[model samples]
Target chain A: IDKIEPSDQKIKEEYNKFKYDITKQAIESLRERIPKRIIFFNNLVNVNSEPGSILNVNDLDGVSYKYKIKHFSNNEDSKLIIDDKVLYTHYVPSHKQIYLELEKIKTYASELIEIIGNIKLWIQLNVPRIEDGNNFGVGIQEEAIQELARVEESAFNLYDAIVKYYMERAKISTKVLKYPNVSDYQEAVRELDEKEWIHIKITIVDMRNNYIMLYDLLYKNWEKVVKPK
Target chain B: KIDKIEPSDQKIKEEYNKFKYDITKQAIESLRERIPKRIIFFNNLVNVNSEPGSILNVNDLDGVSYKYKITHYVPSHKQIYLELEKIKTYASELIEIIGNIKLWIQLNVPRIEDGNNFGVGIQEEAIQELARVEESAFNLYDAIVKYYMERAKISTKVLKYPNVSDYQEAVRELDEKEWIHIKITIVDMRNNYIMLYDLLYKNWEKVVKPKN
Candidate 1:
């Protein structure tokens, strides 16, 4: 068994540090952008009801929403309702497209994680050797390199799309929000429950953490092989 | 009501083109049953200026009435001529087969009626009906193709038509198992039947050589 030397150890440490930094940066960027929680209603109250502000109580909590309404206003189209004072309203816009984008990002990231694990295991099991001394190692080394590049490229593309979606959603938020004042809109934003967004973000973090661990293992195994004394 | 192109001019051209195509198609269709010239020879047994063999160039073979018996016979050569009569017979039977298929399809594959009417599983019913019709149409097509192919083979063997491969190739080309392409044609079978009839009529040349 060849002992790994000081120079080899230095190289391995640097490589591992690089991997750790990149993974943290990517995950942090995503968490920074995603909104706290989205607010929407299944049905709007008094949308096409009688001409005045007499709130038609149609067992609306049962028919439309599962949650009880705290308060409501007489604005016809932009009728605002605060559910349990968490600043929910019929004014809540559709986040369906954003959810779809998130799903695609998750799928791509999952695939990357699996590939990274396989690559890491392959690196650990095999010691670098030219089988026939006739370019045998060349093919295997090139394949590992190609696979890493491919997986990383896909992961980056998905991450890019997710960030773009976050920015687009933020822009859409400012325009579509209908409130009496900057104060009201800002107050609603402050009051909004951070539970849903935090839950989703935690799930994303877990997936990313798993992926990062596999990548770190791959580098560790690579260093062990290349740096053996 | 100023327009770039006159609607009257457009309508006139449209009508003109439609009639022209119909007339041309009808003319070609009529010729499909008739021989252009004369059947001069069959396996060097001659159907030329000689008394027993000669049938004139201008003579329409489909003009002869269908009476499933032999129209002509040469005792020495064991040669038989049933070209005109056979074509007429085949054509009549084709009409009957097509009519039967159409009637069956209409009865069995009821159209998906407007949705307001009370019915459960209307969509599933439509799908099942379509599948049934497709299967039946393919079966009918296979039977017809096989019938003619067998007829052509027999005619080539017994009647001594020289070109056996032509009929055989046509039979080979009739892919019995592949019915998806044929399904649409069977559904809109108005013009398709005529085309099918023409193909059957042409294949009759194996029994009675159409004129050159």
Candidate 2:
């Protein structure tokens, strides 16, 4: 064991040293870059979350109205066991949170993938040492794929929230259709006589007083995000 | 009367026969009283065609030639609006009250003119009239029921017209949608003991007896 080191052992040690040196250099360079990417992505996720918050805030009253209508009766002299406003507020407190999380990533998709790709490349260059070791065990590639998956998941969440918000609005309009003989329908018809959909639009838009959160979330946040960024 | 009374064996034997006859008559009278009276109204008659009658408005085209409506909602579809048994009773009543069966025939059937069939149109109109009559009868009953329903809804103390039943009020309220509209047709039902058209939605009135 104490004999003069063989040529093979010496080569192995030198190769290992070279590999470690490259890894150390890449890691040191990535310190600031990694933190920047992390911070940016976090901001992206956070930014998206804000829209969901705004959506909830806007829809708060409408949600409250729905709660009042469903749980508390429309009958005269009926009293709610709990405050209708409080109940509505508590109903979907996390809706905004979920919406914001989705909103952040919806905004940060390209940026995240670009930074992740760069990080992935750095990992690839430093991790694989062909002379000493043949395998890097796919650790960096796996992490890159995982993060990309996360980005995709976030994109869907944002899309879902957008769809849910709009779909809800549509549903509320359709419900107005059930009572076509009432004031809602009369108002709907006064605007346009022949078309049914126009009637629905009139009613929905007019009654959209309940869904302020939905309107604000879509219009305001969308405006900010879509500002040529 | 004294001459008629004869105290003899022959006279007593005759009296027994008379007693049996009286007993039989009394039993039949009781049985007749138990059975419900079949009431049918057929006082009014409207003639279809004035000239020589050739067209008979029958409901069923495929089976027994019965009158049918071709102009209304379900075009050319034949139907029986009233029950056959009910129509038969009405037909019987008309036969008894209105001296001749030919009058009923003239009312239901149309007389065709030579060259072109003109009476067919007249006969169709007659069927419509018959349908109207049947509708009127049903409407009368439905109005009665509707009045009772309205009366139940209103409080007795608040009732405006105490003498007027709710049904009459309901009848007055029915504009067009609620009114009963019937279709008239005649069916020759030879399957049962009597040939009869069950006048219903499509066919309002028809009369027939057993073919056998």
Candidate 3:
């Protein structure tokens, strides 16, 4: 631009500054805060997430108790492959790095949601309904229904929190794009970022603790939920 | 020679059916409402001590972040112990009601020699259900007693040791053990009620009408 344009480009130059400043500030501001939140949350919620605990079986042992994310090429979209079946598959965004943390959180919720769904399904199949002949205890089904629903809602709430975090991020980006130069507008972006950062950090800890607690409870009791013959 | 069916037979069948129905409705009445209501009461009372995500129990999250300021090592809530005592009383009542249920089933519920018939199956089912009630009540009783024993042990252990962390550790072990078993009492009891009551209700027509 210096070589091509000799005239004083007053209006255009300042506009360029606004765009560069906001973008740089955003990219730079999140550079450290993102990892900080993750690190702090991890230390607090600390649960043993060993491969054998949440995956496919060791084929040699004749037991289905071990497996993990067998990595695929960059060409493939996101899919959680576990226990020799494709449980869930979702579209991967091109700019996945931006949503990398969110994708991890979403994956946790999805895995748990799948497990909870199966628990519900198993109960429905095994327990007799109230309307059926030779119905021993349909209330057993009713009670199981309550237990599964409570767990499902808790897991879904975690996913909702992620959705909430994503929407808040979009609002700030929109504010910067629409009115970057205006003092009120520019300050709003910075202020919102700071406010959201604190809240996000706190929620990361709370959400992680909640997730681990849920994981532990379900791990022990899921087999118990399936009544013994 | 086989005797033909008679109306007097219906009178005896109907008489026994009415008796079983009356006994069931009355015996299951307390198990349905008051028993579960009391168990839930104990759950709420006990959980307030240290359950995460409890609406009433968020005091642990207050103030300084790194460590909690432990004013008292254990939350010796009076109501928790009191409600537990009340539950033990319910346990006694449950045992009698369960026995009363079985007595009627064995004496009143008719039996036949036919192996393929539902008489043996349904009678056995009632027995199985009563067994669940007996087993669950015993489980509930033991769990409550264990909680009681833990309190006793902790009280003495803390008394003997008399250090902050030691006392705290006492509460920790007790908390984990007590929390788990306490849930068993409520959960196991409810589990029994569901099937036992379901049997009584679902098997109602065949049981009461006697034409089946």
Candidate 4:
């Protein structure tokens, strides 16, 4: 197949820049002030080792909200607590903010993967048509698409790691909010924070390296793309 | 941190480590020999052929070589194949362990406090214990991605310099070393899983079942 240019040079370059920018932005967001949420969460957990310690969440005009776990059965049903009020009490946004931001980053990554697929399609449409039997271009296009599919899954891998931890933390934190009693949920939060904090960092490290790799593959191939002038 | 374990525990740990240690260099290198069976099979199923010498008298001696053209762009993926089934199973097992742990945790850990709540303290203990468990489990994903990325990167190089001597040599070196790294992650995931399993199994009553 003759390698033909079916797309504008400007559009191709724009796509390239956009993908690179998204990659950098996604990574940057991960390293941003999101860690503050973790710090706040850990602080809430380690406020005290006293069995009946309570963590005050938000404050305004001296009326404050409190969170803690319990050691009794009847009132200790499945719920997170704030002050004497039940579920309607204000849920602090510290860790919730972290969850929200991570989802945002994942969406950006999803878009980046989508764009990569589009670039591959653009390349395929423009590639020269050879006799049906001899079209290796078809193979290249197929391979790029397949590998991009893996890249998409790889992106989700990092996201899932964080989401899973968040789920665990939510379970424990809810207990603390409800009871305000013993060191039960507080100790849990402290331990989970310590454990998952390191784990999340490790996942990000691996994720960064993998991104470099998959990006290298596409960029190298793009440079060698045989677009017919 | 040094608690004495029975010799029985030691043997089991060794067995689990070896069992979890599936993605060794030897294992991945063996995969190299497997070639892309599905791609080759389909190509053959659809159609096929051979080659001839330059000295041979041919009807279109200067015509574009059908072999070269067909082969050149046969997607680099066709040439580069990696089967992740074994490690995939490992990843799923890790998730399964997490799920099991989660179930035990929830049944025992209610949000509210209660008087007969030694179970509360046990769940508290699980906070730290479970984190270590999930940490190890999540690492399973990282390992697969690293291996997949390595294979994908190598695809570009091999396609670019399929038979270039020195380049191919570099590819081999990269491939082997990365696979070596891959084994490290796999081993870590295995070790963590075994330790976690031992913990939950031994403490089933203490950490899982609610106590008055």
Candidate 1 Cα misplacement greater than 4 A, ranges: A1-92, A97-101, A120-133, A173-229, B1-212
lDDT of 1: 0.33
What is the Cα-based TM-score of model 2?
Answer: 0.20
Better of 2 and 3 by TM-score: 3
User: What lDDT tens digits, residue by residue, belong to model 3 across residues B1-212?
Assistant: 97976546878989877876787665555444444343334434432122122322213321122111232243453545654676676577767777766665566555454444554456556667787778667666667666657566554433322222223333443443343334335434533443454455445444432325
| Candidate 1 vs candidate 2, lDDT winner | 1
Model 2: runs farther than 4 Å from truth?
Answer: A1-105, A121-144, A151-153, A179-229, B1-212
Candidate 2 chain B weakest lDDT stretch, 10 residues: B187-196
lDDT of 3 by residue, A1-229 (tens): 0011112344335323433443343233235422444455577444465544322222122112111111133423243444454422211111123234444554444443334443443344445322326443445454655666675556556543543343344343334334446556545534443444444444455555544453444446544444522
Sorting all predicted structures by lDDT, with the top scorer first, yields: 3, 4, 1, 2
Candidate achieving higher lDDT, 2 or 3: 3
On a 0 to 100 scale, what is the lDDT of residue A29 in model 2?
Answer: 29
lDDT of 2 by residue, B1-212 (tens): 35765546988878977865555444233222211111111101111111111112112223222211111111111222233334445444433322222223343353444544333443344345444444434444454454345334332211221112221222222211111111111111110001011111112222211010
Give the DockQ (C-alpha) for candidate 3. Answer: 0.01
- RMSD to the true structure for each prediction, in A, is 37.9, 40.7, 27.9, 30.3
Prediction 4 global C-alpha lDDT: 0.41
Q: Between prediction 2 and prediction 4, which has the larger TM-score?
A: 4
- Would you estimate the TM-scores of all the predictions? 0.21, 0.20, 0.38, 0.28
Error of 2 at A153 (Å): 4.8
Q: Give the count of colliding residue pairs in each prediction.
A: 0, 32, 4, 27
